Amino acid sequence: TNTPEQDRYLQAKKYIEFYVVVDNIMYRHYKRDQPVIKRKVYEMINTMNMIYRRLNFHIALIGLEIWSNINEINVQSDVRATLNLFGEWREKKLLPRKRNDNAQLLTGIDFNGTPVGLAYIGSICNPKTSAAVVQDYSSRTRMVAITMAHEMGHNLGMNHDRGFCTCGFYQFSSCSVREHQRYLLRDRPQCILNKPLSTDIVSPPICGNYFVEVGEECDCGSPADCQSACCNATTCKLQHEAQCDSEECCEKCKFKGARAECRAAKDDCDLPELCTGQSAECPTDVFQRNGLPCQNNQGYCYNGKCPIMTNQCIALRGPGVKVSRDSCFTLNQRTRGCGLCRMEYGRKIPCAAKDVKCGRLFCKRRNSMICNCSISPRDPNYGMVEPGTKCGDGMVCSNRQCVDVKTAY
Numbered sequence: 159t160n161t162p163e164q165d166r167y168l169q170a171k172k173y174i175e176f177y178v179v180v181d182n183i184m185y186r187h188y189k190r191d192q193p194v195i196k197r198k199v200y201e202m203i204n205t206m207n208m209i210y211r212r213l214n215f216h217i218a219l220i221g222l223e224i225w226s227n228i229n230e231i232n233v234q235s236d237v238r239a240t241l242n243l244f245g246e247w248r249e250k251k252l253l254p255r256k257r258n259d260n261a262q263l264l265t266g267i268d269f270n271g272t273p274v275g276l277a278y279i280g281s282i283c284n285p286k287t288s289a290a291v292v293q294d295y296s297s298r299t300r301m302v303a304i305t306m307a308h309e310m311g312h313n314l315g316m317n318h319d320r321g322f323c324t325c326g327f328y329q330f331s332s333c334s335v336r337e338h339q340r341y342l343l344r345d346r347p348q349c350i351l352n353k354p355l356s357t358d359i360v361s362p363p364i365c366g367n368y369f370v371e372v373g374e375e376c377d378c379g380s381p382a383d384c385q386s387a388c389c390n391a392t393t394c395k396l397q398h399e400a401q402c403d404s405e406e407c408c409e410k411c412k413f414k415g416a417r418a419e420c421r422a423a424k425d426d427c428d429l430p431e432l433c434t435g436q437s438a439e440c441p442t443d444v445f446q447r448n449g450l451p452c453q454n455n456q457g458y459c460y461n462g463k464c465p466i467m468t469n470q471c472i473a474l475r476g477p478g479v480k481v482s483r484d485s486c487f488t489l490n491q492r493t494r495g496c497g498l499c500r501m502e503y504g505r506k507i508p509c510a511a512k513d514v515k516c517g518r519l520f521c522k523r524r525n526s527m528i529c530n531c532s533i534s535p536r537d538p539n540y541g542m543v544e545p546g547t548k549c550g551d552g553m554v555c556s557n558r559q560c561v562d563v564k565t566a567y
């Protein structure tokens with residue numbers, strides 16, 4: 159079932175730029191002693207990376223903050239509300255000052271009940287929900303590290319089905335790995351593709367974690383494991399004349415020649431990246447130009463996707479469904495029922511007749527000539543046709559208007 163390109167995507171090293179926060183209670187538990195706590199955090203991330211090796215993820219600690227003064231959220235024995243408060247704090251307070259793919263709260267409070275942490279599921283790189291929360295419940299750093307690794311498994315799309323698999327043979331059950339993978343394949347989140355700059359990492363270099371840090375030139379693991387002719391495993395220095403070791407654009411300790419491909423296209427709105435002969439790094443993932451016809455002329459590319467009404471229906475509604483006929487979209491001429499184009503001022507605002515395909519999305523099943531739509535008292539964008547969907551020949555949605563593509567891109 160998995161396309162060869164999917165299997166191969168499954169094997170690209172992936173990275174998380176991780177930020178950890180220590181709350182006031184763990185801080186006091188550790189006698190206010192800030193180097194002791196930083197050390198224990200570094201043991202912890204190291205433990206994670208040892209566990210996440212077989213998964214192809216490397217966790218790079220890019221920030222560590224201790225609330226040695228007061229908590230900036232109300233941390234509560236109720237695990238849910240602390241996870242809720244911490245997710246909002248991440249989105250509103252942490253991201254504006256500090257890029258990161260993920261953050262965990264590590265806290266000394268005693269959570270009510272059995273719960274030692276909690277996480278949102280398959281949400282990595284999400285501003286809102288790429289966050290977990292972990293209780294520092296033991297003096298044994300390995301154990302808290304394991305829970306930390308488990309709450310991150312949740313962010314990476316592993317399910318609770320927990321209390322084990324259906325059936326089989328520190329680590330993850332096979333069912334937890336298929337879940338995680340499916341999630342990666344289904345969402346392919348963007349952020350875990352970039353290799354963080356070695357400068358950006360705040361933990362001590364570890365020579366042997368397979369990630370090249372400041373003061374190292376290569377890192378192929380333990381001397382017992384390493385079999386590179388390029389790298390000296392003990393010292394993490396390149397060998398005689400080598401320019402590189404295990405980067406995607408290295409071959410036989412040298413830069414590959416220009417134009418060798420290094421990240422395949424994942425579909426027709428992706429542009430392949432190609433090695434430079436100039437360095438050992440694969441150029442950043444970028445995509446085809448905005449407006450390229452895509453998915454058999456059914457759409458036009460927008461920032462690396464091919465938005466199509468039928469697929470947005472299926473995403474909202476599950477497979478088995480498809481876009482409604484054009485007549486359904488008339489409803490968008492008014493603001494009663496599903497009908498919508500824009501929120502302006504907290505007021506509801508109709509589509510002009512010419513724009514009706516860039517308002518609320520209308521889907522259908524069988525029997526149903528009923529025009530179904532998706533709504534949210536919560537979030538007035540949910541169910542709205544995605545920007546950049548095709549609305550006529552050579553026309554796309556931009557700001558909830560149907561516009562000439564030559565004016566959009």
Ligand SMILES: *[C@@H]1O[C@H](CO)[C@@H](O)[C@H](O)[C@H]1NC(C)=O
Binds near residue numbers: 391393
């Ligand atoms: C690693 O580097 C040192 C330089 O101190 C060298 O003499 C040592 O034997 C090297 N080890 C290997 C296995 O190349």
Ligand SMILES: [Ca+2]
Binds near residue numbers: 173174351
């Ligand atoms: Ca990233």
Ligand SMILES: [Ca+2]
Binds near residue numbers: 364365367371
């Ligand atoms: Ca290293």
Ligand SMILES: [Ca+2]
Binds near residue numbers: 421422423428431444
């Ligand atoms: Ca690309």
Ligand SMILES: [Zn+2]
Binds near residue numbers: 308320
């Ligand atoms: Zn668990």
